[PDB]
């Protein structure tokens, strides 16, 4: 309802714009500016703004709020997100979102925070013209997470974004970083087959020379992510060896990077680092982006744990309240703790179709071997001698002969620590349950202490961290 649309827009445009411009302009306060802009602003634009009041688009006023390019060609993108093709799956404005130049009414009022059109328009060797361009470009493509829109204003958005960029600056890469994430997503996330790649690589080259960490970080994640979805995995594996993640990247950037890296090492046969990277991503960044990811992360995570050699408990399923999403997985877990082969194959097959989706399919075969490995550890540990035939029946192996061969391999790996006596008709337990006997109580301390060293370093550094900014702000 246009008479009601105008209050909503004016407030929204001013509030979001004010925070991006007041922060950017200071230009030498790089750490604060980088953090505020990446996490807070983009997140504000997604979750609070859109949802607030009647009609999710508050875009038409906004285009005029700052400046993109002076003819109404670049503006046109603002109309296209509103209506063309699909029209997204957001609530669009009735009118006053005009094809060419959305709005007739400025909210600019010659501010430094809401700009002025000819005033920004002079800039092209100043950071004032590239920053404004980007903020508006970002806002327009911000609807894409929520909507999962295709071929509206995202047809020329890739090209238009390259135009905004030039040889950039360290301040300009920090604002531009927000745009880089959406640039891949429009063809990536939908999985239209197109080249998002050219641009992504190209910004990457430029940002490394200037050495702006925010920019490089975003590109590397997308490049891995794009490949895996396209089903061109080979490309993603080779990429990692050439990558370097900055150590001064922000918390969202790290979470996305870590999840994506985690799926890759899991394929290689490295479960140990794969589980840790996926868990930490969820706490590191609670984002509204994060909501789409979480179901996949837990689903993939469980199959990934079973392979490492831990069998997860029931409780873990219960707490994140996503138990239902987890539910077909939960059955696979109950099957490993019992250790019986026969149950695993049936369950995993019917369910298997769903599993293909997460990225689990490659792994799925290997989960067969964990079930038996858990059965072998229980047989050797519990008793001394039980007949080979009793074991054959219990796990539901095909033959009593089949039990021998599997037991024989397991000992070599050395996880079991038993002896199988083939001729005598039994397994002998060579192991005894202990952790104080050999050199081993020291190892037991080692692992306990080891997890701690990391926690200590983090607690202490983190404590100091707000005071580091106050110290810089000039307080003792």
């Amino acid at each position: 309802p246009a008479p009601q649309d105008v209050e909503m827009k004016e407030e929204a445009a001013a509030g979001s714009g004010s925070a991006g411009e007041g922060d950017g302009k200071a230009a030498a306060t790089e750490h604060s500016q980088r953090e505020l802009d990446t996490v807070t602003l983009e997140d504000i634009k997604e979750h609070v703004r859109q949802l607030e009041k009647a009609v999710s688009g508050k875009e038409p006023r906004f285009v005029l709020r700052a400046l993109r390019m002076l003819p109404s060609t670049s503006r046109r993108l603002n109309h296209y997100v509103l209506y063309k093709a699909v029209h997204g799956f957001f609530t669009s404005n009735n009118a006053t979102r005009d094809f060419l130049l959305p709005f007739l009414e400025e909210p600019m009022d010659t501010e430094a925070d809401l700009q002025f059109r000819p005033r920004t328009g002079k800039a092209a060797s100043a950071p004032l013209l590239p920053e404004v361009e980007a903020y508006l470009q970002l806002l327009m493509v911000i609807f894409l997470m929520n909507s999962k829109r295709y071929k509206e204003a995202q047809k020329i958005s890739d090209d238009l974004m390259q135009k905004i960029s030039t040889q950039n600056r360290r301040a300009l890469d920090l604002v531009a970083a927000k745009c880089y994430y959406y640039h891949a997503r429009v063809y990536e996330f939908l999985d239209k087959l197109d080249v998002v790649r050219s641009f992504l690589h190209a910004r990457l080259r430029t940002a490394t020379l200037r050495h702006d960490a925010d920019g490089q970080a975003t590109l590397l994640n997308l490049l891995l992510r794009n490949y895996l979805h396209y089903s061109l995995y080979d490309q993603a594996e080779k990429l990692v060896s050439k990558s370097v993640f900055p150590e001064q990247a922000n918390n969202n950037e790290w979470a996305r990077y870590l999840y994506y890296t985690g799926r890759i090492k899991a394929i290689q046969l490295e479960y140990s680092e794969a589980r840790r990277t996926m868990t930490n991503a969820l706490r590191k960044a609670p984002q509204h982006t994060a909501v789409g990811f979480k179901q996949t992360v837990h689903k993939l995570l469980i199959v990934v744990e079973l392979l490492l050699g831990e069998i997860p408990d029931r409780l873990q399923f219960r707490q994140p309240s996503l138990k239902r999403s987890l539910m077909p997985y939960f059955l696979l877990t109950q099957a490993v703790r019992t250790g019986n082969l026969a149950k695993f194959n049936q369950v995993l097959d019917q369910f298997g179709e769903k599993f293909q989706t997460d990225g689990t399919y490659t792994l799925i075969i290997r989960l067969r071997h964990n079930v038996i490995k858990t059965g072998v550890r229980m047989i050797s540990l519990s008793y001394s001698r039980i007949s080979l035939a009793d074991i054959a029946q219990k796990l539901q192996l095909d033959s009593p002969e089949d039990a021998e061969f599997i037991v024989a391999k397991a000992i070599r790996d050395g996880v079991i620590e038993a002896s199988i006596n083939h001729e005598k008709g039994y397994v002998q337990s060579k192991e005894m349950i202990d952790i104080y006997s050999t050199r081993e109580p020291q190892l037991a301390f080692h692992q306990r202490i080891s997890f701690c060293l990391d926690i200590h370093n983090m607690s202490v550094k983190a404590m100091r961290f707000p005071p580091k900014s106050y110290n810089k702000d000039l307080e003792s």
């Binding site: 408990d313 029931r314 109950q334 703790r337 019992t338």
Partner: peptide, 24 residues
């Protein structure tokens, strides 16, 4: 872990009675 309780109550009473006859 697995739900041992549902299974043990039914098994313990019934099996034990047959076991009495079978063995000491």
């Amino acid at each position: 872990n697995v739900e041992d309780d549902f299974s043990n109550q039914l098994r313990a009473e019934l099996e034990k009675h047959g076991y009495k006859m079978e063995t000491s």
